[PDB]
Design a protein around this nucleic acid. Structure first.
Ligand SMILES: [Mg+2]
Ligand SMILES: [Mg+2]
Ligand SMILES: [Mg+2]
Ligand SMILES: [Mg+2]
Ligand SMILES: [Mg+2]
Ligand SMILES: [Mg+2]
Ligand SMILES: [Mg+2]
Ligand SMILES: [Mg+2]
Ligand SMILES: [Mg+2]
Ligand SMILES: [Mg+2]
Ligand SMILES: [Mg+2]
Ligand SMILES: [Mg+2]
Ligand SMILES: [Mg+2]
Ligand SMILES: [Mg+2]
Ligand SMILES: [Mg+2]
Ligand SMILES: [Mg+2]
Ligand SMILES: [Mg+2]
Ligand SMILES: [Mg+2]
Ligand SMILES: [Mg+2]
Ligand SMILES: [Mg+2]
Ligand SMILES: [Mg+2]
Ligand SMILES: [Mg+2]
Ligand SMILES: [Mg+2]
Ligand SMILES: [Mg+2]
Ligand SMILES: [Mg+2]
Ligand SMILES: [Mg+2]
Ligand SMILES: [Mg+2]
Ligand SMILES: [Mg+2]
Ligand SMILES: [Mg+2]
Ligand SMILES: [Mg+2]
Ligand SMILES: [Mg+2]
Ligand SMILES: [Mg+2]
Ligand SMILES: [Mg+2]
Ligand SMILES: [Mg+2]
Ligand SMILES: [Mg+2]
Ligand SMILES: [Mg+2]
Ligand SMILES: [Mg+2]
Ligand SMILES: [Mg+2]
Ligand SMILES: [Mg+2]
Ligand SMILES: [Mg+2]
Ligand SMILES: [Mg+2]
Lengths: 60, 206, 263
RNA sequence: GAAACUGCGAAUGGCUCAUUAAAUCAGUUAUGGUUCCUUUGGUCGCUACUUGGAUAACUGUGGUAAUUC
RNA sequence: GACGACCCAUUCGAACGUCUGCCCUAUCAACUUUCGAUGGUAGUCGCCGUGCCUACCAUGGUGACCACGGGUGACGGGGAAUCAGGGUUCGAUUCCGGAGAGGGAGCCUGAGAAACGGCUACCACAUCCAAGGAAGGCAGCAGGCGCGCAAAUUACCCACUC
RNA sequence: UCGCUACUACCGAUUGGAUGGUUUAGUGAGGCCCUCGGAUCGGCCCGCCGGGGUGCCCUGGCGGAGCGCUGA
């Protein structure tokens, strides 16, 4: 799956592609509007907190 | 949905009639309210023309009146005793027009003792020493003859009504439709109405 | 089919005293809601483009009205289907002329230019007398006007002359036997005479007799009588003919003997 | 002055005659047993030198074979 | 001046009621009734009157003056053809009223709808699909297939009437 | 009467078929109402700073606690 990351501070968005499920295990079985630590998604992400805000199914 | 049309009935001869049109909206349903007793909730229905209409559920306070005295007060509704239409409307404590209810009877006692300077049905007097004899036997030399002696002679509450005030409840009839207004108003029974309803209650239960 | 109110009127179903053709089109003005009933009114477009020939289409009467030229009862009406009616006053000061809608003799409105000093008041028939909050007497006239504080000796069917600028009832005539009147409905729509009788049927439709200025008598319902004078003396100016209703034979005799063809 | 929010209209008109036999409909009367946008006329006095946050369009990232998503 | 607004009246209506008026049929003579049929009392609901619906009572209501049941290639009327006098037949159809939007059913918004150029389901049809999903209602104007003995252009314009 | 051709209607095994219209009993989509439900979204109350006043208070912002009351 892809991700759409948004920084509401400077007003900047970016799409990201991540394939390895290990990075994605952070978000699985977690309803919308819950904050998590995104430091599992890479090493540029170390002290980062992200809030899930929604998404789209396959078939949109 | 539910309909109030005349065209599903048989005609006077006993013959069927066939419909000519589908159900209209000026022929509507809107199921019953079934007002219980409890903390207030009131919903609002939008009806023909706008004209919102309040449907009550769980009323617990009414505005009742004493017609001999011309004295009306807000009061609490305690229970339902009689219901001329059905009997399952007393088992479920549902409150409709022309029901027979028990009320709290306290504000009428307050107004009476204050207006006449005279007690209701009372068993013994010790509680009257710090207070209440303060109201009833007010320490004043002006008025307390001239006014309250014209209040006297008239202060002759009948046997049944003064017997009511002892147990702390009355018998009242609802004279407003809570399902349409959202209010439970009425009047406290007296005289032959009181005798009739008391006899009916005594005869039904037990 | 018909779930609400209608807004079109077919040319064949329109009132007949509008004197319309049958080949212009399927549709008629359909007067908008106002102080006069639909079958007893006369829209502005018909009065301007048909009886006065000032306009030639609907666009022309629209752009005549959109210049604040036409005044009905003092106020400026911008609508072209406004329902003007009986005893109304039209005023066009760009040309200095005033009219008055009154049935002539044959059940239709006439063109009845009047003096500017007469285009100040209007007569109104009282339909209702009720009391409002705090015991204030009100009136209701035949053109929806409401008057507060009338003198407590005016009753139903009486006529009141009111100032067009201020309301403010000025004088009044009483419904009594001997008073001039014009019939405003039914078969005798337009005839003028004195009352001389009032038959009474408790429960329905008390009828009233009339006898005009030539010894002819005719009856009507009380709902169509309109007192317009004390007696043998109108308060408003009468049109040509004065509601006499000369029969078809006399009509033919006067049209032939006078040889009214042209000038 | 585009777009978009807001207000109003979309219950009119057009079409057809399947159903329907005291039903529709017609003349006659009644709402003193009801509702009525709009029109016209009446009614408008028992931090104030002006309050609150939050969505469109617009900017920017997207999802689906596909839609006025 | 514009706009907005509680209430009353007016206007435009809508709804529910009164009296009278209907084609053929007896190889339709008795019908209606806890699955309200006719009335009484109290209520629920409804914009309001009312078995409209509920509880408790009474046993009523219609019919040979054709009730009740069945048929109609039956929408009603204003009207049309024929006609010495009387009559007979027609009225799908341009004005008034009613009903419907493939068949039933249920609702939202709204002053006003049980609306289909609105929504939600079932039935009958039928369209696209990447098979996961999505979308539909010409008895509106043109046009097409089918049915038949049987009925027109996939035109131009808001200049007129509104 | 029997016989020849042609046409029409009738009775009838077939326990015929097609289309329906009522209909006992059983199930029952969807909307509406009622009693619950509580994903989420805010406000109030306490420190540091910026602005005003008399170590504290008021708007605001920040991280947060009690998350206690609370509204949709
Ligand atoms: Mg029908
Ligand atoms: Mg209203
Ligand atoms: Mg229509
Ligand atoms: Mg108009
Ligand atoms: Mg502009
Ligand atoms: Mg409007
Ligand atoms: Mg609308
Ligand atoms: Mg056609
Ligand atoms: Mg029948
Ligand atoms: Mg009848
Ligand atoms: Mg009629
Ligand atoms: Mg009628
Ligand atoms: Mg006004
Ligand atoms: Mg009853
Ligand atoms: Mg009743
Ligand atoms: Mg019997
Ligand atoms: Mg029958
Ligand atoms: Mg039948
Ligand atoms: Mg038919
Ligand atoms: Mg016929
Ligand atoms: Mg003849
Ligand atoms: Mg017809
Ligand atoms: Mg046909
Ligand atoms: Mg046709
Ligand atoms: Mg009608
Ligand atoms: Mg319909
Ligand atoms: Mg079809
Ligand atoms: Mg509206
Ligand atoms: Mg529909
Ligand atoms: Mg339509
Ligand atoms: Mg649609
Ligand atoms: Mg269509
Ligand atoms: Mg077509
Ligand atoms: Mg062919
Ligand atoms: Mg032909
Ligand atoms: Mg052909
Ligand atoms: Mg045009
Ligand atoms: Mg043969
Ligand atoms: Mg079956
Ligand atoms: Mg069931
Ligand atoms: Mg359900």
């Amino acid at each position: 799956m892809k991700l759409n990351i948004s920084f509401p501070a400077t007003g900047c968005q970016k799409l990201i592609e991540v394939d390895d499920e290990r990075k994605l295990r952070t978000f699985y079985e977690k309803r919308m509007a819950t904050e998590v630590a995104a430091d599992a998604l890479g090493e540029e992400w170390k002290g980062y907190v992200v809030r899930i805000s929604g998404g789209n199914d396959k078939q949109g | 949905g539910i309909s109030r049309d005349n065209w599903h009935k048989r005609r006077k001869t006993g013959g069927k009639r066939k419909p000519y049109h589908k159900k209209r909206k000026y022929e509507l349903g809107r199921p019953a309210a079934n007002t219980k007793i409890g903390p207030r909730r009131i919903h609002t229905v939008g009806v023909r023309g706008g004209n919102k209409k309040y449907r009550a559920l769980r009323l617990d306070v009414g505005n009742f009146s004493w017609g001999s005295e011309c004295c009306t007060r807000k009061t609490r509704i305690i229970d339902v005793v009689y219901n001329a239409s059905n009997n399952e409307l007393v088992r479920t404590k549902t409150l409709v027009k022309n029901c027979i209810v028990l009320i709290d009877s306290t504000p009428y006692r307050q107004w009476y003792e204050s207006h006449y300077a005279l007690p209701l049905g009372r068993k013994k007097g010790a509680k009257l020493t710090p207070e209440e004899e303060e109201i009833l036997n007010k320490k004043r030399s002006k008025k307390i003859q001239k006014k309250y002696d014209e209040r006297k002679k008239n202060a002759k509450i009948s046997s049944l009504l003064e017997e009511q005030f002892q147990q702390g409840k009355l018998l009242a009839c609802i004279a407003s439709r809570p399902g349409q207004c959202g209010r439970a108003d009425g009047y406290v029974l007296e005289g032959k109405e009181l005798e009739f309803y008391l006899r009916k209650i005594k005869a039904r239960k037990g | 089919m018909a779930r609400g109110p209608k807004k079109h009127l077919k040319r064949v179903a329109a009132p007949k005293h509008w004197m319309l053709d049958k080949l212009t089109s399927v549709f008629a003005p359909r007067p908008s809601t106002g102080p006069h009933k639909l079958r007893e009114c006369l829209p502005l477009i018909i009065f301007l483009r048909n009886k006065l020939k000032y306009a030639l289409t609907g666009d022309e009467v629209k752009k005549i009205c959109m210049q604040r030229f036409i005044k009905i009862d003092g106020k400026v009406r911008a609508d072209i289907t406004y329902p003007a009616g009986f005893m109304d006053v039209i005023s066009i000061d760009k040309t200095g002329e005033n009219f008055r809608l009154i049935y002539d003799t044959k059940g239709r409105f006439a063109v009845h230019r009047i003096t500017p000093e007469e285009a100040k008041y209007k007569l109104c028939k009282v339909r209702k007398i009720f009391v409002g909050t705090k015991g204030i007497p009100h009136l209701v006239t035949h053109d929806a006007r409401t008057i507060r504080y009338p003198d407590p000796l005016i009753k139903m069917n009486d006529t009141i002359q009111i100032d067009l600028e201020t309301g403010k009832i000025t004088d009044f005539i009483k419904f009594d036997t001997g008073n001039l009147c014009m019939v405003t409905g039914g078969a005798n729509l337009g005839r003028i005479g004195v009352i001389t009788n009032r038959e009474r049927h408790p429960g329905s439709f008390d009828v009233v007799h009339v006898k005009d200025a030539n010894g002819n008598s005719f009856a009507t319902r009380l709902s169509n009588i309109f007192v317009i004078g004390k007696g043998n003396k109108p308060w408003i100016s009468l049109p040509r003919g004065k509601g006499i209703r000369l029969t078809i034979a006399e009509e033919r005799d006067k049209r032939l003997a006078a040889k009214q063809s042209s000038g």
